[PDB]
Design a protein around this motif. Sequence first.
Motif: not given
Lengths: 60, 63, 80, 206, 62, 24, 98
Positions: E27, E43, E39, E32, E46-47
């Motif tokens: 991850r 997200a 997701t 991710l 984080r993305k």
Amino acid sequence: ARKALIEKAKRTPKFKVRAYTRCVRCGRARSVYRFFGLCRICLRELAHKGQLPGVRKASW
Amino acid sequence: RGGGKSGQIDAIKLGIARALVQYNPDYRAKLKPLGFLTRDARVVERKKYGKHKARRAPQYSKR
Amino acid sequence: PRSLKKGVFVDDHLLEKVLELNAKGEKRLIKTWSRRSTIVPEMVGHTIAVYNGKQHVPVYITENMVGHKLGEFAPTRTYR
Amino acid sequence: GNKIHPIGFRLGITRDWESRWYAGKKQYRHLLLEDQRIRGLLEKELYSAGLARVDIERAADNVAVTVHVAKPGVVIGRGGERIRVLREELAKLTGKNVALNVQEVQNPNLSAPLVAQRVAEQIERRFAVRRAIKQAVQRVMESGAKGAKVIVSGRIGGAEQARTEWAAQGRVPLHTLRANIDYGFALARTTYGVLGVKAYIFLGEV
Amino acid sequence: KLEGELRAEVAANIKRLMDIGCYRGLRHRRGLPVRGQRTRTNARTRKGPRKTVAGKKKAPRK
Amino acid sequence: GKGDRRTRRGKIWRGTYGKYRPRK
Amino acid sequence: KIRIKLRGFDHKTLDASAQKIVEAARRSGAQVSGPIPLPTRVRRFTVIRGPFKHKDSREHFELRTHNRLVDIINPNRKTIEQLMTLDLPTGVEIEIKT
RNA sequence: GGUUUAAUUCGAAGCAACGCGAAGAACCUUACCAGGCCUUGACAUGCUAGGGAACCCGGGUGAAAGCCUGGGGUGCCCCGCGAGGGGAGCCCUAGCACAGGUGCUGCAUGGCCGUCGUCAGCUCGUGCCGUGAGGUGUUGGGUUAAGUCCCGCAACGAGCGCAACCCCCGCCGUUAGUUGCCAGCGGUUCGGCCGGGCACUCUAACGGGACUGCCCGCGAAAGCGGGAGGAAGGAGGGGACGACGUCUGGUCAGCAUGGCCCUUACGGCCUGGGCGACACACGUGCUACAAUGCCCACUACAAAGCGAUGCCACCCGGCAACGGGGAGCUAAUCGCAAAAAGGUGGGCCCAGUUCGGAUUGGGGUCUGCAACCCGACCCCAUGAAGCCGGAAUCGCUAGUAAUCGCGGAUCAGCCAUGCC
Ligand SMILES: [Mg+2]
Ligand SMILES: [Mg+2]
Ligand SMILES: [Mg+2]
Ligand SMILES: [Mg+2]
Ligand SMILES: [Mg+2]
Ligand SMILES: [Mg+2]
Ligand SMILES: [Mg+2]
Ligand SMILES: [Mg+2]
Ligand SMILES: [Mg+2]
Ligand SMILES: [Mg+2]
Ligand SMILES: [Mg+2]
Ligand SMILES: [Mg+2]
Ligand SMILES: [Mg+2]
Ligand SMILES: [Mg+2]
Ligand SMILES: [Mg+2]
Ligand SMILES: [Mg+2]
Ligand SMILES: [Mg+2]
Ligand SMILES: [Mg+2]
Ligand SMILES: [Mg+2]
Ligand SMILES: [Mg+2]
Ligand SMILES: [Mg+2]
Ligand SMILES: [Mg+2]
Ligand SMILES: [Mg+2]
Ligand SMILES: [Mg+2]
Ligand SMILES: [Mg+2]
Ligand SMILES: [Mg+2]
Ligand SMILES: [Mg+2]
Ligand SMILES: [Mg+2]
Ligand SMILES: [Mg+2]
Ligand SMILES: [Mg+2]
Ligand SMILES: [Mg+2]
Ligand SMILES: [Mg+2]
Ligand SMILES: [Mg+2]
Ligand SMILES: [Zn+2]
């Protein structure tokens, strides 16, 4: 549901956290008001037939 | 007893206005047209299902 | 930030099996379906095959990964 | 959509509960279940008597089942050897000692459950539905009654496309509480599907 | 442990779970949500910004 | 406000108690 | 000083049998503390009207327990003798303490 | 939705699918996937010879299911002096009658629901009209929230609808005093704590109260405008309540149910995985972008609910989640319980800030056999995007919108910001 899937009958469920509910009338596993032991759909049917003593159409 | 202080204000107001009339029934003349004798029957409206909040209706798309 | 209190958990059928193979030599591969079990220091050595819902996997077992749970090493889903 | 159960609506006033006992939130669940088992063993075995309703009452452990049938003949039997068998067959499911009573139905043509129940049985004996209904209503209207209404569901006559047949005369005032409208539903297990028979019977006012 | 001596305690802390066979490592490597999120949507943090692609070939306007 | 776990408002919103909303 | 918390699901049947518990006398033997109102407890159930979807349908049911108190001071034995087979309601229940 | 996948179980489709079935997906639930197994079967009623048969702790293998095996027990009826023969019951294989299927079909159905629409409408009997389908009634003039009432008229009435009957709120009375009080005096360990009384508040049963009933003006009438008296005035406020029908609407996965289909698997049990997958898109929400604000401290006012293998006062340990101890309460009496915005004090000073709490590293708590996939909570550190949002677009006419907290259902726990 599946007649087989009343292994809710399994008095020992091995772990007490595999214990679940089911409508005692129809098998429904998903809105079983624990007071009555009946699912939501059966509850309304029995309520309307007047076979749930004291239970009544409620408005306020 | 009960509710919230701003309603307690309005309720005391009715309380006073009533005592002051059973102390001298003539006071109504300079008291009734002001409205102080009436009781404010305006009360919180019940929460309706399929609404968010009695009248607040849930928002929808595509129409 | 996880959860092992004043209990600590390792599924035991796998444990009595690994400690057994610590009386002598290390069994190449152990077939487990319990990804549930934390890794103890006594597992550092013998390669355990963690399941997957589909396949046991050759999870070699370094000392750099002791406090971790087994299933943390057998990815479930397949992606691109 | 539409139309609430004309019973469950009037349940407050003009119609009282079939089973009328009290129980705490650790008991209600159990009494209710067993209460049901009784209705099941009762509605199956007493078909011939044609049971309109089953009142059930409870108290100091004991249970007062008060069965209402058109023909109390069939629940008595050999001068008794039937009302005993059934008060006995209830003693097994209910470990709590039962008391079976039997209530005459003066006028089966004034109890909606039976009227509907009547129609149901004909539809299986392949009677002509349209007439059955016009007739059924008349038999109810001829027996006094301020009004009455019957309804058969769908697949009238084996007909591939489900329909609905009607009939009703007199007043059948559904939205008035002050009514008394006995309601009754009968199922009709035919060769080619199921059919539903709803029966309404108005009488009295206040 | 503050500033520098921390920033590379954490960085090297991540490389740990990246260097073992760990899931949180994957991850971390993909980029991710490590802490078990969804997701399918949402997200973004984080993305990075949205990498929008063509959606249909024969279906209405959306 | 209501989103921060370590505040009055925030702890009230999420049922809880703790360092930042003492039980008493 | 006997305690009698009465309760059932119907209140026409309560007040008409709490009254029948106050049959010692109106106020000539033991004191009689009058049939005590005592708030009712209302359970509610809210059911989605149809099977399968239609979230916004809903229908309310309630089951309400009504509770009375009464309580008689200075229990003469014949007052108690009347607490034998003298009842008619079926859906009314009877807690007794002293 | 799409894509991905061993599987990402199924359904829901513009209004009226999309925080919908689901009012609780770690295992369970479960319907899906892989792998290990089971077969007259996890459940029902049975029918032929066969060995033994209520039953109680073992062993090997195993992820568990399951398969395999050693061992005391051998009772209850009839015939026999007996060794033994025949047998009711429950246990038993190897066959048959059947089970089971969330497999298909709302494109066969019931039931229940949604929807136009709480819209004011849909009809019927008899008469009259018209060769007839049909019409009149129900069109017209007023009027109403209303085919509501009035006036009229080849129509006179009636039914299902409207309204009323039921509930909750607003004023008042009677019944009722282990909740309520400087009402009134006595005591105070200044708490309605104590005596003490129920007046008041309340609690909850039964009643009164409204009627365009009264006055002024327009009106042929129904009614309209206004004004008194009243707590409330023309439907006082909010519920429950949905017509003949429409959609061949939703649902055979809640339940029935016709037909079709599988029957060493389309049934059954496990263990593990999945339903939680991420390049993307939409819906409904939550939390925000701050000074009418945020933080800390003190302090004030709710309603409705729930509580036994439950709520947990209070005490001790911990920064804390929480652990140890322990009181009371089958609860108008004990507890959840702090209501929160508000008020008083202090701080911050226009800043991506003492705004915002996303992400991530670490250390813990509790629930559960078990929290890797995938729980909630607490603590430390991290402190993202966000300075009010294009085209477009939603709600709301009054205790309404806006805003603030509280409770329940489901439920070990909980992904609840959802719902009631
Ligand atoms: Mg079934
Ligand atoms: Mg569970
Ligand atoms: Mg509000
Ligand atoms: Mg073993
Ligand atoms: Mg802050
Ligand atoms: Mg509705
Ligand atoms: Mg595929
Ligand atoms: Mg399907
Ligand atoms: Mg709507
Ligand atoms: Mg699962
Ligand atoms: Mg035998
Ligand atoms: Mg079959
Ligand atoms: Mg249908
Ligand atoms: Mg209307
Ligand atoms: Mg002509
Ligand atoms: Mg003619
Ligand atoms: Mg016309
Ligand atoms: Mg007109
Ligand atoms: Mg009318
Ligand atoms: Mg009405
Ligand atoms: Mg009063
Ligand atoms: Mg004094
Ligand atoms: Mg007039
Ligand atoms: Mg469909
Ligand atoms: Mg899902
Ligand atoms: Mg969409
Ligand atoms: Mg402390
Ligand atoms: Mg200040
Ligand atoms: Mg704005
Ligand atoms: Mg409006
Ligand atoms: Mg807001
Ligand atoms: Mg819960
Ligand atoms: Mg809440
Ligand atoms: Zn059910």
